Amino acid sequence: SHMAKTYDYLFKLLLIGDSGVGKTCVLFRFSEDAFNSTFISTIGIDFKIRTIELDGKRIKLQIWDTAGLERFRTITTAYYRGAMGIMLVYDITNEKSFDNIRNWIRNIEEHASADVEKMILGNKCDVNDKRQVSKERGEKLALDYGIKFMETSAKANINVENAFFTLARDIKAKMDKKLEGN
Amino acid sequence: SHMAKTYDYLFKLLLIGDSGVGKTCVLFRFSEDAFNSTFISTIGIDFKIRTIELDGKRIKLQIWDTAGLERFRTITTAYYRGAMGIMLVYDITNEKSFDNIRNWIRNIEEHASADVEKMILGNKCDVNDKRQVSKERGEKLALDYGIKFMETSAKANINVENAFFTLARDIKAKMDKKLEGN
Amino acid sequence: LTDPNRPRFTLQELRDVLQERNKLKSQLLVVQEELQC
Amino acid sequence: LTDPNRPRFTLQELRDVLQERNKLKSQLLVVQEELQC
Ligand SMILES: Nc1nc2c(ncn2[C@@H]2O[C@H](COP(=O)(O)OP(=O)(O)OP(=O)(O)O)[C@@H](O)[C@H]2O)c(=O)[nH]1
Ligand SMILES: Nc1nc2c(ncn2[C@@H]2O[C@H](COP(=O)(O)OP(=O)(O)OP(=O)(O)O)[C@@H](O)[C@H]2O)c(=O)[nH]1
Ligand SMILES: [Mg+2]
Ligand SMILES: [Mg+2]
């Protein structure tokens, strides 16, 4: 329909990581500020949209939420090439979902832009009694890869806002230095 | 949102019959007045909406287009209970799709309202050279079941308008005599 | 099992996405009609 | 093969419906935003 747009930037984001780590719940906390405890695993892919403000500019965030289960891999693959930032999510109560982060990283390296912005979320950081992945170990992984990390909880609403704005701010800053230098 | 409606009636219609007889093409001729020759088989179910005028009243038609292929049977079943009129479509160039009409009729008798309005469409009636089902035989089938019949072509646009208005008019007339007599 | 037509997804999986597809199309036609402004 | 979790539909079948679901949701959010009247 070719009408004037109501945003200045458009950031395509991608959440990836194993089934059940809480990717959908983290996005629904960011986009609706709600939390449902019942598991509704993501069939293939879904998306949510939120517009935020950075340095007084309108940033539309088109956030793509992939299925973690193996049978959806070909479907979710199609969504890597366009992403500008990617949340790699694991579950602090599940060591496998954290070991698998380095597989998710290799997946990105195979399918995404060479310079995509990456962040690690250790989610469910409200379930201390069941913790398997120390906070120190998530930090050293992300340091080993030179990318940012934080512990999140969609349920207790911990670091969800901060994760997306930080990733949004880092995409914007790199983009602005590209646009300015062209 | 509880807002004033822009129709006086709402008729839920169902197209059923074998895969490839032209159910989708008949609906796309009714709702868009177009015809595409390439086959895009219907995944499960789809629907189209058109509002027509009868006796000076606004009739919203919510037309449900089922998949004919066997693997979608449980999916399409859910849509029988609410239908008010049903197009049973066969392909004049395919005897099997016409023999199978009496299976489609038994399907209706198992799943739809006892008094649902039924019509037989012999579609592709523009392909004379490949005809297998004589027009006389479609007529005697529909007479055997006391329901209306016509030969249609979505491609040459034959009897598509007439089929839906007639079915719409017969639903409306029976409904009005019910509403009046209550 | 390298076959493109291998059956892979369940009734539940397909029917859920279809039902959402219907709900969205239905809602979109409503808000499109809401535009007589 | 009476099993609810029997695999039944193809990649093509599911991905097509998903892509339409996305297109519809995208269009619906647009026409919803178009309502600041
Ligand atoms: N206590 C707690 N539970 C959570 C949290 N995040 C998610 N959950 C629960 O963990 C389960 C899995 O969460 P989802 O967001 O559906 O997981 P997912 O990563 O989207 O899984 P897939 O779509 O299958 O890839 C759900 O039952 C959630 O309620 C959290 O921060 N804290
Ligand atoms: N010549 C001619 N071809 C037609 C006509 N109607 C449909 N076709 C062709 O027949 C093929 C099947 O038509 P569809 O409408 O897709 O069939 P369908 O009944 O919806 O099949 P399913 O969705 O699989 O149940 C398509 O390639 C059409 O182009 C017609 O009236 N005349
Ligand atoms: Mg999910
Ligand atoms: Mg069809």
Residue numbers in the entry:
A (entry chain A), B (entry chain A): -1 to 180
C (entry chain D), D (entry chain D): 125 to 161
The authors write:
Parkinson’s-disease-associated LRRK2 kinase phosphorylates Rab8a and Rab10 to subvert their membrane trafficking functions in the formation of primary cilia. Rab8a is phosphorylated at a threonine (pT72) and subsequently binds to a phosphospecific effector (RILPL2) via its C-terminal RH2 domain. Here, we show that recognition of pT72 involves a dual arginine motif involving R130 and R132 from the RH2 domain of RILPL2.
Here, we have determined the structure of pRab8a in a complex with an extended RBD of RILPL2 (117–165; abbreviated as RL2117) at 1.9-Å resolution. The structure includes residues preceding the X-cap that were not mapped in our previous work. The structure of GTP-bound pRab8(Q67L) in complex with RL2117 forms crystals with one molecule of pRab8a and one molecule of RILPL2 as the repeating unit. The biological heterotetramer is generated by a twofold crystallographic axis down the length of the central parallel α-helical dimer of RL2117. Although the RBD of the complex begins at 117, residues 117–125 are disordered. The model contains residues 126–161 of RILPL2 and resembles closely the minimal RBD (129–161) of the previous structure (pRab8a:RILP129 complex). The complex with the extended RBD (RL2117) has two well-ordered stacked arginines in which R130 appears to stabilize the conformation of R132, which directly forms a salt bridge to the pT72R8. As a measure of the close contacts, the distance between R130(Nε) and R132(NH2) is 3.4 Å. In contrast to the other complexes, pRab8a:RILP117 forms a symmetric twofold axis down the length of the coiled coil.
